[PDB]
Symmetry: C5
Subunit: 217 residues, 5 copies
C-alpha cells in the first residue's frame, strides 16, 4: 500500500526520466536519408463514406490511417527504467512521416487526439482518424455495379530512396464500417505501387486505396 | 482588504508549486492506471441530415479523475480547498467520439476545477456531428442513434471509465428543439478489437428521438 | 516638444512593466475575493433565423466591466497617465459564455481592453452568435420570442456576480435595414439553481422579441 | 555583400534593442491614412441582408521610433517585415457579420523616414439590404471603418481622396459599380466628450446587363 | 555508420541555421529570381451565381541563395535535405484575385540542395474571380488569375516560368470539366499608383463542361 503507493510515484519519475534522455540527447530525428532510409507501414480502416457529390465530383471519407515505423534514436532498455516497455506521447514531440492524399480537394480534418505510442525497440505507432474530401466521380453509385474511386497516399517530399512504404495486407479494414451509411462498400483495397517519372531517376512509392461502393437500399 | 492580497498570493503560490516545481503528470500506465468518470448532459439535437446520415448534437461532457500529484493540504495555503485553472495547465484525458464526422467544436471555456484531494472536474460543452441514420424520425416510434466515447490511445488497463448513472441528464434539454427526446442512455462497455491485444472501454450513448409536433 | 512624447512612451512602457511583471496575472476570483462583472449588450442585427434547425444568429457588442486592486496605480508616479489600452491577452478576462450557443462564438473586433488607474477594466468584444431559438411566429404581428443566458461557465455566484446597468438592451445601433425588426430586447440579472450544482449561478438573460420587417 | 548584414543590423536596432512603441496616446497621437481598392462584390444575399466584398485596404502611418539614417545602415532606404514584428492599427468594419478573411501575406513596408505601409487584402461580410440591385437605380450600401478602442484624440483618420479606387475592379463581376466613396467623418456622440472618426465606405451597384 | 550520416546532417542543418542567420529577404541591391510553375489538378467547382471558380493545383517554387550552399565533402557527401518551410525564408507569392483564403493541401516542407537552391511545392485549393459564362458550350469558358509577390516589386523579386505551358499530366481524368488550354505567362508593367515595375505570372485557363 504505502509500499504500493511509492511504486506509483517511482514509475512516474522513471517515465519522465526516459522522456528526458530520449527527447534531448540526440535531439529530434532530422528525417530519413538515402544512407539511412525509413520503411513506413501504412494501413486503412474505413468508417464511412459520408457524402458523394456528383455536381463537383468529390467524395468525403471518414477513416483511420494506421502508420508504423522504427527508429534507432528511440531505442531504450526497459531495465534502466523500471520495466517501461512503452509510453504515450504527443505527436509533435516526435518526427512523423509526411503521408498525404495526392488528390484531396480540401485540407484533411483530424478526428482523434494527436498522440502516438513509442515502444522500447524504437518502433512507433500513430493512428490519426480523419475526414478526407478527394477527387472522385460517383457515376454508377445508384446501380447494382456501384461506383469506383481511387486515392493515392504517399510521402510528399521523400522519394522511394528516402521513404519506402508497405502494407501488411491489401485488404482495407472494414470491421468498423458504419452499418447505416448512405453507401455500402462493395470492396476496398490498399495496394503498394512503384512508378518512375521520366525526369529524375528516383522511384516513387504510394499506397493506392481503391473503393467500390453503392447506395445502401 | 489586506486579506484579499494574502489569499491571492496563496493561490498563486499553490498553482506555482503544483505546476512549476513539479512536472506534468505523464498520463496513466499499466502500473499507474487511471479511472475516468463520464456523464453526459444533452442540450439539443440541432440538426438531422438524411442525405448523409449525420446528426448534430450539442451536449455537456462531464469528466472526473483524481491524481495524487495534484493534492495539497489546504492549511499550507490559507485554507484554499479548490481553484480554477486553464485546462492547458494540467493533464486531461483523450476522450473521443469514435464515430464523429467532423472535428468536435468546443463551446465553453477550457477551464477545469481542481480540489485539494487531487480530484479534477472538467466539463466541456460541445457540438458534435456523428454517424446516424435518422430514418423514422418523423414517426411516433422515432429514430434511434448511438455513439461511443472512450480513450483513443489508452486500453482498459491504462484508462478505465465509469458512469455514476446510466441515464443521460435531460434536465437542460432545449424545449423548443426541432426534436424531442424519447430516451437517452449512457452505458459502460468493455470490448475486444482485433487491432489491439487489450480490451478497450467505452461509454455508449444511445438516443431515441423524433420530430416534435 | 518632441522630448515629451518620448518620456510619456517611457512612462507607459514603465507602468505596463510594473503592472504586468512586478506581479503575475491575477489568478481569478475566489469565495474570499469575489468579483462583480457588469454586462451590457448592444444588439446590432439579427442576421439569420433558421426554422429548420431552430437556430438564430445574432451580431452584438458585449460591454464587460470589472475592477481589480491589482491593476490600480498612482497617475503622478507615471506622468499623469490615467489609463491605457492593452491586448486582452495581457490581462485576465472573465469567461462569459452563452449557455445555449450552438456553434463557437465568432469575434468581430480587435481583442483590446482599456485599463484605468482606479483598477477598472472595460472590454467590449463584438460577436456573432448562433444559439437555440424557435423563430415560430416571426411572420406574425406579435413576432417571435427568444432568450439566451450569459454567465460564467466555471464560477458560481460565490465567485462571480453579474450585473446590468439597465434591463434595457441598447438598440441604438440596430441595423435599420435588417430582415428583422426589434419589438423588445431585455437584459436581466437572474439567480439560478441548477440540479447539477449546490451553488447558485448568476446569469444575464437576454430576451429578444422580433418579427420580419415588412 | 555586407548589405545583408546591414539589413540584419537595422532590424535589430529598430526591434531587438529599441523599446518598441506601446501604441498611440493622447500625449502622442497618431494619424493613419486609409484607402480602399474595391476588387469585387462577390455575393449579395437578400435573405439575410449580407453582402460580401473583396478589397485591398491601404493603411499608412509614421513613427519616430522607426526612423533611421540610410547611409548609417549602408544606404538602406527601406525594408519588409512581418506585420507581427511591428505595431499595427486596430481598424475594423463596424458592421461586419463575420470575421474578416485575410487574403494577402501579412507583411508591411517600412521606410527610413519612419513611415509604414500595410495593405491587407480582405473578404468582408457586412450588413446590407441589396434591395433594388436588379433595378437600373441599383442598390446602395455603407460600412464604417475605424479604430475600435482609440478615439479621435489618439488616432486621427485621413484619406488621400474620397474616391474608392476601382482600377482593379473585376471586369466580369456579377455586379457593376455605379459609385464608390470613402469619406472621412468626424463623429461626436453623447456618452462621451471626445470626438470619434470613421471612414464611411458607400457603394452603389447593380446586376450587370 | 548509418549512425554517422544522421549526425552529419544534424550538424549541417545547425551550421546553416545557427551561425548563419537566415536571409533577411531580397533587396534592390541583391534581387532574387523566383521560378514558378503550375500543375493543374482539377477545376472542382464553377459558381455562376457569384462568379467564383475553385481550382486544385501544385505550385512549384524554386529559388537560390548563397547563404544556403555548402560543400558536400565538409559534411559527408550530403547533397540535399528536407526541412520545414518555416525554418527558411520563402517567397510571399499570392493569387491577386482570390475570393477566399487559399487552403493548403500538402505538408509545408522544402527540399534544399547544396548549391543553395530550394524547391517548395505547396498543393493548394484556390477560389478566385471567374465568370464561367459559356462553360457549357463548344467554345467553353475562359478565366485568368495572376500570381505574384504581394510586398516586393520587380526591383526585389523577379519572376520566371520554366515554360509557358501549365502541366496537365496530373489533371483529374473524370473532372466535371475538361481543359481546352492552360498557360502561365510572365507579365511586367507599371501601375498608376506606384513607380516601381511590377511582375506577375498570369494563369489563363480555358475549359468546358465534360461531354
Ligand atoms: N518535382 C516535383 N514536382 C511536383 Cl509537381 C511535385 C513534386 N512532389 C512534391 C515535392 C514537394 C517539395 C519538394 N519536392 C517534392 C512529389 C510528388 C507529387 C505528386 C505525386 N507524386 C509525387 N515534386
Ligand atoms: N492498433 C490500432 N489500430 C487501430 Cl485501427 C486503432 C487503434 N486505436 C487507436 C490507437 C492510437 C494510437 C495508439 N494506440 C491505439 C484504438 C481503437 C480505436 C478504435 C476502436 N477501438 C480501439 N489501434
Ligand atoms: N456539475 C456540473 N454539471 C454540469 Cl452538466 C455543468 C456544470 N457547470 C456548468 C454550468 C452549465 C449550465 C448551468 N450552470 C452551470 C459548472 C462547472 C463547469 C466546469 C467545471 N466545474 C463546474 N457543473
Ligand atoms: N462606451 C462604448 N460603448 C460601445 Cl457599445 C462601444 C465603445 N467602443 C467601440 C466603438 C464602437 C463603434 C464606434 N467606435 C467605437 C469603444 C471601446 C471599445 C473597446 C474597449 N473600450 C472602448 N465604447
Ligand atoms: N501602393 C499599393 N497600392 C495597392 Cl492597392 C497595392 C499595393 N501592393 C500590392 C499589389 C497588388 C496587386 C498588384 N500590384 C500591387 C504592394 C504593396 C503591398 C503591401 C505593402 N506595400 C506595398 N501597393
Ligand atoms: C515489465 O515488468 C515486469 C515486472 O513486473 C517484468 O518482469 C516484465 O518482463 C515486464 N513486462 C514485459 C512485457 O516485458
Amino acid at each position: 500500500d504505502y509500499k504500493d503507493d511509492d511504486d506509483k510515484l517511482h514509475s512516474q519519475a522513471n517515465l519522465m526520466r526516459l522522456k528526458s534522455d530520449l527527447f534531448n540527447r540526440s535531439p529530434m530525428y532530422p528525417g530519413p536519408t538515402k544512407d539511412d532510409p525509413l520503411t513506413v507501414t501504412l494501413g486503412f480502416t474505413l468508417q464511412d463514406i459520408v457524402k458523394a457529390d456528383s455536381s463537383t465530383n468529390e467524395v468525403d471519407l471518414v477513416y483511420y490511417e494506421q502508420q508504423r515505423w522504427k527508429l534507432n534514436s528511440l531505442m531504450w532498455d526497459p531495465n534502466e527504467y523500471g520495466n517501461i516497455t512503452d509510453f504515450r506521447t504527443s505527436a509533435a514531440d516526435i518526427w512523423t512521416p509526411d503521408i498525404t492524399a495526392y488528390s484531396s480537394t480540401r485540407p484533411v480534418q483530424v478526428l482523434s487526439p494527436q498522440i502516438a505510442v513509442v515502444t522500447h525497440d524504437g518502433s512507433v505507432m500513430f493512428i490519426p482518424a480523419q475526414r478526407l474530401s478527394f477527387m472522385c466521380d460517383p457515376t454508377g453509385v445508384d446501380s447494382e455495379e456501384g461506383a469506383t474511386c481511387a486515392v493515392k497516399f504517399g510521402s510528399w517530399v521523400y522519394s522511394g530512396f528516402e521513404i519506402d512504404l508497405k502494407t501488411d495486407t491489401d485488404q482495407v479494414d472494414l470491421s468498423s464500417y458504419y452499418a447505416s451509411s448512405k453507401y455500402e462498400i462493395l470492396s476496398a483495397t490498399q495496394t503498394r505501387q512503384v512508378q518512375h517519372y521520366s525526369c529524375c531517376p528516383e522511384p516513387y512509392i504510394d499506397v493506392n486505396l481503391v473503393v467500390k461502393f453503392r447506395e445502401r437500399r
